[PDB]
Amino acid sequence: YYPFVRKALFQLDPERAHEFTFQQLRRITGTPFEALVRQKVPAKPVNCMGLTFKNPLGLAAGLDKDGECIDALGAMGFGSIEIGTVTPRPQPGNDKPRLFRLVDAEGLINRMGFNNLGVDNLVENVKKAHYDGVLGINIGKNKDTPVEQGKDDYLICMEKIYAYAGYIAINISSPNTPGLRTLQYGEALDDLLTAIKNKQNDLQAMHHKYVPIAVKIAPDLSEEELIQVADSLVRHNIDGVIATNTTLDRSLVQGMKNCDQTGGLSGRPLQLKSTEIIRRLSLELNGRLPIIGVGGIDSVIAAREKIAAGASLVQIYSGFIFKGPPLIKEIVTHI
Amino acid sequence: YYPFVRKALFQLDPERAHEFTFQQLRRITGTPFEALVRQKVPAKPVNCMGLTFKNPLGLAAGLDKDGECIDALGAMGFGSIEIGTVTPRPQPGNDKPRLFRLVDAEGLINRMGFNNLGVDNLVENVKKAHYDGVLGINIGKNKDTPVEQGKDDYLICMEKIYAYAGYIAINISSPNTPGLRTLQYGEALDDLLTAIKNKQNDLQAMHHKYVPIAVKIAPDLSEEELIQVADSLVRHNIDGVIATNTTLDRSLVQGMKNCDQTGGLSGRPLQLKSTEIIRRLSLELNGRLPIIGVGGIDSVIAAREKIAAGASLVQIYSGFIFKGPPLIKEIVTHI
Ligand SMILES: Cc1cc2nc3c(=O)[nH]c(=O)nc-3n(C[C@H](O)[C@H](O)[C@H](O)COP(=O)(O)O)c2cc1C
Ligand SMILES: CCCCCCCc1cc(O)c2ccccc2[n+]1[O-]
Ligand SMILES: CCCCCCCc1cc(O)c2ccccc2[n+]1[O-]
Ligand SMILES: O=C(O)c1cc(=O)[nH]c(=O)[nH]1
Ligand SMILES: O=C(O)c1cc(=O)[nH]c(=O)[nH]1
């Protein structure tokens, strides 16, 4: 039962608990010892972005940032796994402590800052995996890269992962790399998307492989901001949009431990906002391109709320922490 | 641990689980066995409709229709308890099976139809209770009473319960008595509200105290209908609005067992609709009378989402069935 494992894990500091569990997952992933974490879940194929997803539930980015546990996590039943965020060069992220639990609110605050081993390392791990689901690779900009030259970072990552990725995710919604969210505003977004779309075509002719590209947005976008962001995605024929990353909002966690920590709020306190963001976005997009819904999904009803607001697929992260593998089985079985 | 209790009770059909549970509650009342139900909760006093509530969390109507376990349920930490619905004359309600569990959705469907022992009996039960929180007494129309004369029934009950109620809840939102929901439309509502306020006025003069009246509305109302209901509640000086009852919607429960069962849906499948109803009603009311929020509250954040949409108090029914007494402590502690 996950309640017992969680009580134990929750004795440990958030980031420490993660490093221990993933040490253990590393040592079993891709080995017959993944029967320890294997869950049988039904098939629920979904066509999306020109790919078949074996089921509608993906693991959102940030949990396996370096691509170390693809097979073990696939063994728990995810229909897609989004690894990353990976930056062209490794970088340590922001100073610890940078990860905080809000246990009563079943939410998380984090200011990781893209802590990853770099895109070259990620490709080596992906080469070793045998996951039959859809693999998405999330990419972002090195901390030290000028925001006016962010495109250059997204394009080197694209060249190195194109051959091994089912889909590519463009993270421009972390609040933990300064200025990064500006890349979703006006001319900056247009230039970045034009570069990404041109490289995707180039790469498609090079490797002879269709790889869709989806942009991950933030939930703190204003209505005019959202409107402009939807229009740009359609105008540049982006293949899909991942809505939504973490929030700088703290309106539902006041008076709670760690609510004043800086960073992104995830989990149940993000659920409602992300659903409203997807509704509004779906109304603007009008079926022109699909949405992958992410934001406090912690039950099959919450997953279905995102479907009803317009999402074609869904991803979970914080609900996996607070409810465990069983959430995967619940959501895949009944969505 | 409630999960064990739930697994046992869920071996019974929902109506039998309930009456088996309530037999044991009536039996442990006033014995040292009442401590198995007793839960110490933090005091969070809140003033609303001119009453002081122990804490913001109440038990919604329909769990104790005859007022038989006021003491045992109070001991569990509720800051208020709403009994009913009760009708002037006893009536059996609709045919069994009339109550259904949707376990993976943590929802319920019911078509009880105001099965109750009558207002005189509830009054005798209230006289024997010792609860020190706010007692709400929820009243309704007998099935046989014609819809156009529904007000007669509300007035008969108001007279028999005025000396005993902390507040009175007028139920015009059950989907399970034919035409009852038309009493929240147009002239019917205006007529009902006038007769009720005049009875209130007469009864204050007779008993020398003001007992506030709250009207319970439905989540299936349109925007225009909700604007009219709010305007009528303000023009008639109603002391509060209870939003929201069960839903005829099945959009989030498709493909699930008991989903085609006729009646009202409660639980997690109603949460979002209830919240959106409260937000809209709150804009229309602009603070002129309080909202008691109800519908799918199963967590501290879900209760807080209702407060944010404009409610002053919240109530739970289905979440108490699915998550148990620990939910009372969780919400009252961190709301
Ligand atoms: C079995 C059952 C019986 C109910 N009986 C009543 C009732 O008699 N009067 C009333 O006003 N509401 C009644 N309700 C509705 C609840 O009081 C509440 O308004 C609705 O269920 C939404 O709350 P919830 O999602 O927390 O259960 C009943 C609900 C259920 C599930
Ligand atoms: C091994 C079954 C799945 C559980 C993985 C738990 C590892 C884990 C545990 C936590 O408490 C975390 C808190 C915040 C962010 C991430 C966390 N992770 O990744
Ligand atoms: C003492 C535990 C608190 C929960 C009460 C359990 C009894 C109980 C169990 C159920 O499965 C029900 C299903 C629908 C409606 C009411 C129900 N009740 O009242
Ligand atoms: O790693 C991070 O800092 C990070 C990236 C991202 O996209 N979202 C987030 O909340 N944190
Ligand atoms: O008893 C019922 O049928 C009933 C009454 C009411 O007010 N609401 C509801 O959902 N059911």
JSON list of N, CA and C in Angstrom, two decimals, chain A residues 111-152:
[
{"chain": "A", "resi": 111, "resn": "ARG", "atom": "N", "xyz": [11.90, 25.06, -6.81]},
{"chain": "A", "resi": 111, "resn": "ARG", "atom": "CA", "xyz": [12.68, 26.00, -7.62]},
{"chain": "A", "resi": 111, "resn": "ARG", "atom": "C", "xyz": [13.96, 25.33, -8.10]},
{"chain": "A", "resi": 112, "resn": "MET", "atom": "N", "xyz": [13.78, 24.14, -8.67]},
{"chain": "A", "resi": 112, "resn": "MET", "atom": "CA", "xyz": [14.91, 23.34, -9.15]},
{"chain": "A", "resi": 112, "resn": "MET", "atom": "C", "xyz": [15.88, 24.16, -9.99]},
{"chain": "A", "resi": 113, "resn": "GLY", "atom": "N", "xyz": [15.41, 24.85, -11.02]},
{"chain": "A", "resi": 113, "resn": "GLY", "atom": "CA", "xyz": [16.31, 25.61, -11.91]},
{"chain": "A", "resi": 113, "resn": "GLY", "atom": "C", "xyz": [16.96, 24.77, -12.99]},
{"chain": "A", "resi": 114, "resn": "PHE", "atom": "N", "xyz": [16.28, 23.74, -13.48]},
{"chain": "A", "resi": 114, "resn": "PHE", "atom": "CA", "xyz": [16.78, 22.88, -14.58]},
{"chain": "A", "resi": 114, "resn": "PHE", "atom": "C", "xyz": [18.05, 22.14, -14.15]},
{"chain": "A", "resi": 115, "resn": "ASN", "atom": "N", "xyz": [17.98, 21.41, -13.05]},
{"chain": "A", "resi": 115, "resn": "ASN", "atom": "CA", "xyz": [19.13, 20.58, -12.61]},
{"chain": "A", "resi": 115, "resn": "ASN", "atom": "C", "xyz": [19.22, 19.33, -13.49]},
{"chain": "A", "resi": 116, "resn": "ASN", "atom": "N", "xyz": [20.22, 19.27, -14.38]},
{"chain": "A", "resi": 116, "resn": "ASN", "atom": "CA", "xyz": [20.30, 18.12, -15.27]},
{"chain": "A", "resi": 116, "resn": "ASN", "atom": "C", "xyz": [21.74, 17.91, -15.73]},
{"chain": "A", "resi": 117, "resn": "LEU", "atom": "N", "xyz": [21.98, 16.69, -16.21]},
{"chain": "A", "resi": 117, "resn": "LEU", "atom": "CA", "xyz": [23.29, 16.24, -16.65]},
{"chain": "A", "resi": 117, "resn": "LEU", "atom": "C", "xyz": [23.56, 16.54, -18.12]},
{"chain": "A", "resi": 118, "resn": "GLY", "atom": "N", "xyz": [22.71, 17.31, -18.78]},
{"chain": "A", "resi": 118, "resn": "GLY", "atom": "CA", "xyz": [22.99, 17.68, -20.15]},
{"chain": "A", "resi": 118, "resn": "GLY", "atom": "C", "xyz": [22.41, 16.71, -21.16]},
{"chain": "A", "resi": 119, "resn": "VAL", "atom": "N", "xyz": [22.23, 17.22, -22.38]},
{"chain": "A", "resi": 119, "resn": "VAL", "atom": "CA", "xyz": [21.48, 16.49, -23.39]},
{"chain": "A", "resi": 119, "resn": "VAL", "atom": "C", "xyz": [22.26, 15.29, -23.91]},
{"chain": "A", "resi": 120, "resn": "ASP", "atom": "N", "xyz": [23.59, 15.39, -23.98]},
{"chain": "A", "resi": 120, "resn": "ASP", "atom": "CA", "xyz": [24.40, 14.26, -24.43]},
{"chain": "A", "resi": 120, "resn": "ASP", "atom": "C", "xyz": [24.23, 13.06, -23.52]},
{"chain": "A", "resi": 121, "resn": "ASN", "atom": "N", "xyz": [24.24, 13.31, -22.20]},
{"chain": "A", "resi": 121, "resn": "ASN", "atom": "CA", "xyz": [24.02, 12.22, -21.25]},
{"chain": "A", "resi": 121, "resn": "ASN", "atom": "C", "xyz": [22.63, 11.62, -21.40]},
{"chain": "A", "resi": 122, "resn": "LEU", "atom": "N", "xyz": [21.61, 12.47, -21.59]},
{"chain": "A", "resi": 122, "resn": "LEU", "atom": "CA", "xyz": [20.26, 11.97, -21.75]},
{"chain": "A", "resi": 122, "resn": "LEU", "atom": "C", "xyz": [20.14, 11.06, -22.97]},
{"chain": "A", "resi": 123, "resn": "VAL", "atom": "N", "xyz": [20.79, 11.42, -24.09]},
{"chain": "A", "resi": 123, "resn": "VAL", "atom": "CA", "xyz": [20.71, 10.57, -25.27]},
{"chain": "A", "resi": 123, "resn": "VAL", "atom": "C", "xyz": [21.33, 9.20, -24.99]},
{"chain": "A", "resi": 124, "resn": "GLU", "atom": "N", "xyz": [22.42, 9.15, -24.22]},
{"chain": "A", "resi": 124, "resn": "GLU", "atom": "CA", "xyz": [23.03, 7.85, -23.94]},
{"chain": "A", "resi": 124, "resn": "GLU", "atom": "C", "xyz": [22.08, 6.93, -23.17]},
{"chain": "A", "resi": 125, "resn": "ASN", "atom": "N", "xyz": [21.37, 7.48, -22.17]},
{"chain": "A", "resi": 125, "resn": "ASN", "atom": "CA", "xyz": [20.39, 6.69, -21.43]},
{"chain": "A", "resi": 125, "resn": "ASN", "atom": "C", "xyz": [19.23, 6.26, -22.31]},
{"chain": "A", "resi": 126, "resn": "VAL", "atom": "N", "xyz": [18.68, 7.19, -23.10]},
{"chain": "A", "resi": 126, "resn": "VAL", "atom": "CA", "xyz": [17.56, 6.85, -23.97]},
{"chain": "A", "resi": 126, "resn": "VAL", "atom": "C", "xyz": [17.95, 5.70, -24.90]},
{"chain": "A", "resi": 127, "resn": "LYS", "atom": "N", "xyz": [19.21, 5.68, -25.38]},
{"chain": "A", "resi": 127, "resn": "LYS", "atom": "CA", "xyz": [19.67, 4.58, -26.24]},
{"chain": "A", "resi": 127, "resn": "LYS", "atom": "C", "xyz": [19.55, 3.21, -25.57]},
{"chain": "A", "resi": 128, "resn": "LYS", "atom": "N", "xyz": [19.53, 3.16, -24.24]},
{"chain": "A", "resi": 128, "resn": "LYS", "atom": "CA", "xyz": [19.49, 1.89, -23.52]},
{"chain": "A", "resi": 128, "resn": "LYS", "atom": "C", "xyz": [18.08, 1.44, -23.16]},
{"chain": "A", "resi": 129, "resn": "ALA", "atom": "N", "xyz": [17.06, 2.24, -23.46]},
{"chain": "A", "resi": 129, "resn": "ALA", "atom": "CA", "xyz": [15.71, 1.94, -22.99]},
{"chain": "A", "resi": 129, "resn": "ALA", "atom": "C", "xyz": [14.94, 1.19, -24.05]},
{"chain": "A", "resi": 130, "resn": "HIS", "atom": "N", "xyz": [13.91, 0.47, -23.60]},
{"chain": "A", "resi": 130, "resn": "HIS", "atom": "CA", "xyz": [13.12, -0.39, -24.47]},
{"chain": "A", "resi": 130, "resn": "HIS", "atom": "C", "xyz": [11.65, -0.18, -24.20]},
{"chain": "A", "resi": 131, "resn": "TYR", "atom": "N", "xyz": [11.27, 1.06, -23.95]},
{"chain": "A", "resi": 131, "resn": "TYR", "atom": "CA", "xyz": [9.91, 1.40, -23.60]},
{"chain": "A", "resi": 131, "resn": "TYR", "atom": "C", "xyz": [9.04, 1.42, -24.85]},
{"chain": "A", "resi": 132, "resn": "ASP", "atom": "N", "xyz": [7.90, 0.73, -24.79]},
{"chain": "A", "resi": 132, "resn": "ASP", "atom": "CA", "xyz": [6.98, 0.63, -25.91]},
{"chain": "A", "resi": 132, "resn": "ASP", "atom": "C", "xyz": [5.92, 1.73, -25.89]},
{"chain": "A", "resi": 133, "resn": "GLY", "atom": "N", "xyz": [5.99, 2.65, -24.94]},
{"chain": "A", "resi": 133, "resn": "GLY", "atom": "CA", "xyz": [5.12, 3.81, -24.93]},
{"chain": "A", "resi": 133, "resn": "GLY", "atom": "C", "xyz": [5.73, 4.93, -25.75]},
{"chain": "A", "resi": 134, "resn": "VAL", "atom": "N", "xyz": [5.08, 6.08, -25.71]},
{"chain": "A", "resi": 134, "resn": "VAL", "atom": "CA", "xyz": [5.62, 7.25, -26.38]},
{"chain": "A", "resi": 134, "resn": "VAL", "atom": "C", "xyz": [6.59, 7.94, -25.42]},
{"chain": "A", "resi": 135, "resn": "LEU", "atom": "N", "xyz": [7.79, 8.22, -25.90]},
{"chain": "A", "resi": 135, "resn": "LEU", "atom": "CA", "xyz": [8.79, 8.97, -25.14]},
{"chain": "A", "resi": 135, "resn": "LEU", "atom": "C", "xyz": [8.79, 10.42, -25.62]},
{"chain": "A", "resi": 136, "resn": "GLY", "atom": "N", "xyz": [8.58, 11.34, -24.68]},
{"chain": "A", "resi": 136, "resn": "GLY", "atom": "CA", "xyz": [8.72, 12.77, -25.01]},
{"chain": "A", "resi": 136, "resn": "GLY", "atom": "C", "xyz": [9.97, 13.30, -24.34]},
{"chain": "A", "resi": 137, "resn": "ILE", "atom": "N", "xyz": [10.75, 14.11, -25.05]},
{"chain": "A", "resi": 137, "resn": "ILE", "atom": "CA", "xyz": [11.99, 14.70, -24.48]},
{"chain": "A", "resi": 137, "resn": "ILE", "atom": "C", "xyz": [11.79, 16.20, -24.31]},
{"chain": "A", "resi": 138, "resn": "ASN", "atom": "N", "xyz": [11.81, 16.69, -23.07]},
{"chain": "A", "resi": 138, "resn": "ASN", "atom": "CA", "xyz": [11.59, 18.12, -22.78]},
{"chain": "A", "resi": 138, "resn": "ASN", "atom": "C", "xyz": [12.94, 18.83, -22.80]},
{"chain": "A", "resi": 139, "resn": "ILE", "atom": "N", "xyz": [13.01, 19.98, -23.46]},
{"chain": "A", "resi": 139, "resn": "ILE", "atom": "CA", "xyz": [14.26, 20.73, -23.59]},
{"chain": "A", "resi": 139, "resn": "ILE", "atom": "C", "xyz": [14.08, 22.18, -23.15]},
{"chain": "A", "resi": 140, "resn": "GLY", "atom": "N", "xyz": [15.14, 22.75, -22.58]},
{"chain": "A", "resi": 140, "resn": "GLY", "atom": "CA", "xyz": [15.13, 24.13, -22.12]},
{"chain": "A", "resi": 140, "resn": "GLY", "atom": "C", "xyz": [16.50, 24.78, -22.23]},
{"chain": "A", "resi": 141, "resn": "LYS", "atom": "N", "xyz": [16.57, 26.04, -21.81]},
{"chain": "A", "resi": 141, "resn": "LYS", "atom": "CA", "xyz": [17.77, 26.83, -22.05]},
{"chain": "A", "resi": 141, "resn": "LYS", "atom": "C", "xyz": [18.69, 26.80, -20.83]},
{"chain": "A", "resi": 142, "resn": "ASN", "atom": "N", "xyz": [19.99, 26.73, -21.10]},
{"chain": "A", "resi": 142, "resn": "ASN", "atom": "CA", "xyz": [20.96, 26.83, -20.02]},
{"chain": "A", "resi": 142, "resn": "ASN", "atom": "C", "xyz": [20.75, 28.13, -19.27]},
{"chain": "A", "resi": 143, "resn": "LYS", "atom": "N", "xyz": [20.99, 28.07, -17.96]},
{"chain": "A", "resi": 143, "resn": "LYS", "atom": "CA", "xyz": [20.81, 29.27, -17.15]},
{"chain": "A", "resi": 143, "resn": "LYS", "atom": "C", "xyz": [21.59, 30.45, -17.73]},
{"chain": "A", "resi": 144, "resn": "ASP", "atom": "N", "xyz": [22.85, 30.23, -18.12]},
{"chain": "A", "resi": 144, "resn": "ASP", "atom": "CA", "xyz": [23.75, 31.30, -18.53]},
{"chain": "A", "resi": 144, "resn": "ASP", "atom": "C", "xyz": [23.53, 31.76, -19.96]},
{"chain": "A", "resi": 145, "resn": "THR", "atom": "N", "xyz": [22.58, 31.17, -20.67]},
{"chain": "A", "resi": 145, "resn": "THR", "atom": "CA", "xyz": [22.39, 31.55, -22.09]},
{"chain": "A", "resi": 145, "resn": "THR", "atom": "C", "xyz": [21.54, 32.82, -22.12]},
{"chain": "A", "resi": 146, "resn": "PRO", "atom": "N", "xyz": [21.94, 33.87, -22.85]},
{"chain": "A", "resi": 146, "resn": "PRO", "atom": "CA", "xyz": [21.10, 35.06, -22.97]},
{"chain": "A", "resi": 146, "resn": "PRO", "atom": "C", "xyz": [19.70, 34.69, -23.47]},
{"chain": "A", "resi": 147, "resn": "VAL", "atom": "N", "xyz": [18.66, 35.33, -22.94]},
{"chain": "A", "resi": 147, "resn": "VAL", "atom": "CA", "xyz": [17.26, 34.97, -23.31]},
{"chain": "A", "resi": 147, "resn": "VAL", "atom": "C", "xyz": [17.02, 35.31, -24.77]},
{"chain": "A", "resi": 148, "resn": "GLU", "atom": "N", "xyz": [17.79, 36.25, -25.31]},
{"chain": "A", "resi": 148, "resn": "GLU", "atom": "CA", "xyz": [17.67, 36.61, -26.74]},
{"chain": "A", "resi": 148, "resn": "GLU", "atom": "C", "xyz": [18.29, 35.50, -27.59]},
{"chain": "A", "resi": 149, "resn": "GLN", "atom": "N", "xyz": [19.08, 34.62, -26.97]},
{"chain": "A", "resi": 149, "resn": "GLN", "atom": "CA", "xyz": [19.76, 33.53, -27.72]},
{"chain": "A", "resi": 149, "resn": "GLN", "atom": "C", "xyz": [19.23, 32.19, -27.22]},
{"chain": "A", "resi": 150, "resn": "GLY", "atom": "N", "xyz": [18.08, 32.21, -26.55]},
{"chain": "A", "resi": 150, "resn": "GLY", "atom": "CA", "xyz": [17.46, 30.96, -26.07]},
{"chain": "A", "resi": 150, "resn": "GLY", "atom": "C", "xyz": [17.27, 29.98, -27.21]},
{"chain": "A", "resi": 151, "resn": "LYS", "atom": "N", "xyz": [16.81, 30.46, -28.36]},
{"chain": "A", "resi": 151, "resn": "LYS", "atom": "CA", "xyz": [16.59, 29.60, -29.54]},
{"chain": "A", "resi": 151, "resn": "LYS", "atom": "C", "xyz": [17.79, 28.70, -29.78]},
{"chain": "A", "resi": 152, "resn": "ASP", "atom": "N", "xyz": [18.99, 29.26, -29.72]},
{"chain": "A", "resi": 152, "resn": "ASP", "atom": "CA", "xyz": [20.21, 28.48, -30.05]},
{"chain": "A", "resi": 152, "resn": "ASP", "atom": "C", "xyz": [20.29, 27.25, -29.15]}
]
